């Protein structure tokens, strides 16, 4: 009965709220406002990669901190070389609408996706010295948002049909499907041990999934608008979300409650990309004001501006060793900072 | 052999650069459109009659997927691309950001079903004021003009029932009606046109405009009209860089 289920849902929500309140004792910022801040940090561009025509939606660093791949709306996939700014490969795309890309851990495969509901995987160890689409994946009923390789034979995809699934490269079927979201999933990030991952959707709520079984372990709320990006802490026990309400927040899996609320007064723009650093201390983010503010972890105060882009910033990433920091915007340019 | 290896790589970078240089002049020589309508608006039919303007390849039919691009139809020796969105979900407030640099947006309105006319009116207002779709002009098509006639001619009409503003509406003097038409049908035909035009008046200042047209189900001048409107759009953009407008 609807009415019966109404009281059950209300009681469950009240119990969850009471459990959250019981575990809360004091705020972290007020109880630890003694340590010195990191100061003001400034970067400057060192390399500027050119060649793309239209805007750029995604990019991914390699596992050697020397090769990176970028996807643009012009329909071209380009593999760069940050050391000498010399291109290596240029793979034309079957469809001109691409919204995501990925790099294999072994440096032998890539991925792409967009408005077309098919994910394409390309091989870079070909005998003919060229490139060839090996496998294509079908089954989603919505535009793809993000995809990250897990190994040489598994991949995780996100789509706009409120579903997430895990595929098999050798033979293409949905080995596991994760359902429960209400809005469209926008981003996801795999854990360092490839045991769990999180994904935010267009419902102001996040979730945690188990790649093995497929159950939704935890769910977190707090935001007041759509979730646009999500990252993963290097330790494997935290993540940050950037929404369209011009606010940034941090969550802890064990605490199950938000800790930091990074905000300001004069900024009204939605977050577009979020990434951490090697030390888990310098959180980088994108904005609609054509900037990329470097915020902190415990400081909570923009301590660096990455101005220099004349259009919207859509993608952001950092190397595994942290030596270089890359960026990309809608002006079809890439910049590398130090 | 550092130089030798570096030379191999430099040579490679120059090869993958000539291809990009060749593709740059092809990318900028075509126009991208975005056609979107309603479930019952004649959208499909219009897309089907542009086919007449454009183991090998024959009737390429792939899997049921999204982003159904048309026949790369072209007219007057210039290429046009049109993207008919399909097989998507109801919500469209997120993927609409992709078409922020298209030449124009084609909007099709079913001006024969009075019931949902007002619900179609809102979508045009929402797309007009969007921040991303703020410098992109829109082309308006009023489809199914034949069915309108019958309506006003039958009994059960009452077009001021869902719109009690028709009572005082007088036909504009500038209105050029077609020779051999009826006064009643001229009043109804032009009373819907300025409904959409009033929304376009707000947030104007020459940033973008709207072009209305009285199209039909089997009209063959659509590709002409689109070409003329795109030509008008391109010319106005160039003049604004020389501060002439």
């Amino acid at each position, epitope marked *: 009965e609807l009415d019966q289920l109404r009281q059950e849902a209300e009681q469950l929500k009240n119990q969850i709220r009471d459990a959250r309140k019981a575990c809360a004792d004091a705020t972290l910022s007020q109880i630890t406002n003694n340590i010195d801040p990191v100061g003001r940090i400034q970067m400057r561009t060192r390399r500027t990669l050119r060649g793309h025509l239209a805007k750029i939606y995604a990019m991914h660093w390699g596992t050697d901190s020397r090769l990176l791949v970028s996807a643009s709306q012009d329909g071209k996939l380009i593999i760069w070389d940050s050391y000498t700014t010399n291109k290596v490969h240029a793979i034309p795309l079957r469809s001109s609408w691409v919204m995501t890309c990925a790099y294999a851990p072994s440096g032998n495969y890539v991925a792409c996706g967009g408005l077309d509901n098919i994910c394409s995987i390309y091989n870079l160890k070909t005998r003919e010295g060229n490139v060839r689409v090996s496998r294509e994946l079908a089954g989603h009923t919505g535009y793809l948002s993000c995809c990250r390789f897990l190994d040489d034979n598994q991949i995780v995809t996100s789509s706009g049909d409120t579903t997430c699934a895990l595929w098999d490269i050798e033979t293409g079927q949905q080995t596991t499907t994760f359902t429960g979201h209400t809005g469209d999933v926008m981003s996801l990030s795999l854990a360092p041990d490839t045991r769990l991952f999180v994904s935010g959707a267009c*419902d102001a709520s996040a979730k945690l999934w188990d790649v093995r079984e497929g159950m939704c372990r935890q769910t977190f709320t707090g935001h*007041e608008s759509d979730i646009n990006a999500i990252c993963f802490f290097p330790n494997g026990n935290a993540f940050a979300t950037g929404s369209d309400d011009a606010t940034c927040r941090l969550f802890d899996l064990r605490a199950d409650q938000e800790l930091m609320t990074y905000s300001h007064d004069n900024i009204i723009c939605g977050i577009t990309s979020v990434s951490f650093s090697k030390s888990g201390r310098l959180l980088l983010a994108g904005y609609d004001d054509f900037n990329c503010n470097v915020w902190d972890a415990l400081k909570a105060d923009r301590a660096g501006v990455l101005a220099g882009h004349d259009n919207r910033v859509s993608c952001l990433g950092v190397t595994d060793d942290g030596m270089a920091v890359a960026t990309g915007s809608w002006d079809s340019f890439l910049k590398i900072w130090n | 052999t550092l130089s030798a290896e570096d030379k191999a790589a430099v040579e490679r970078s120059k090869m993958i650069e000539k291809q990009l240089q060749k593709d740059k002049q092809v990318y900028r020589a075509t126009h991208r459109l975005l056609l979107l309508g309603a479930d019952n608006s004649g959208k499909s039919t219009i897309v089907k009659q542009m086919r007449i303007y454009h183991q090998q390849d024959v009737l390429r039919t792939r899997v049921k997927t999204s982003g159904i691009f048309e026949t790369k139809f072209q007219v007057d020796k210039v290429n046009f691309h049109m993207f008919d969105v399909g097989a998507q979900r*109801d*919500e469209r*407030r997120k993927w609409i950001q992709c078409f922020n640099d298209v030449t124009a947006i084609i909007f099709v309105v079913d001006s024969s079903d009075y019931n949902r006319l*007002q619900e179609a009116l809102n979508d045009f207002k929402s797309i*007009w004021n969007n921040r991303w779709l703020r410098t992109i002009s829109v082309i308006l098509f009023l489809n199914k003009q034949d069915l309108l006639a019958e309506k006003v001619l039958a009994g059960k009409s009452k077009i001021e029932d869902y719109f009690p503003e028709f009572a005082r509406y007088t036909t504009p003097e500038d209105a050029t009606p077609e020779p051999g038409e009826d006064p009643r049908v001229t009043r109804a035909k032009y009373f819907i046109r300025d409904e959409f035009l009033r929304i376009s008046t707000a947030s104007g200042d020459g940033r973008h405009y709207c072009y209305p047209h009285f199209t039909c189900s089997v009209d063959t001048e659509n590709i002409r009209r689109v070409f003329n409107d795109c030509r008008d759009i391109i010319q106005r953009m160039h003049l604004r860089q020389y501060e002439l407008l």
Partner: nanobody
Amino acid sequence: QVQLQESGGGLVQPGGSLRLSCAASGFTFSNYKMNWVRQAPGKGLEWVSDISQSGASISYTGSVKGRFTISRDNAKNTLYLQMNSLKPEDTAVYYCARCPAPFTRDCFDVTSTTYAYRGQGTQVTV
């Protein structure tokens, strides 16, 4: 999460001068656009009226004009939807709608099938 609550609906004598008030929590009420959406039985969703951020700009659906009123109230965090001169077709379910983005005058997905920031709805009858 974000929860929207409305009340005042039910069964009442014709010409009862119904009261419709929307309760909001979990977000800043002074930063979003408020709309009104109705779903009559036997057909889909319909849009009725909208209000500006500060209540300046006001628009109405052509069918119902000069019989309904809207009043955004920031201090009390309620809405005023007094009405009169009922019609037999007015029997429907009213849903309190919201706007996903702040600091913006327009936003889609107000009449979507599976929207999120929409009220639970109340039943009214003549």
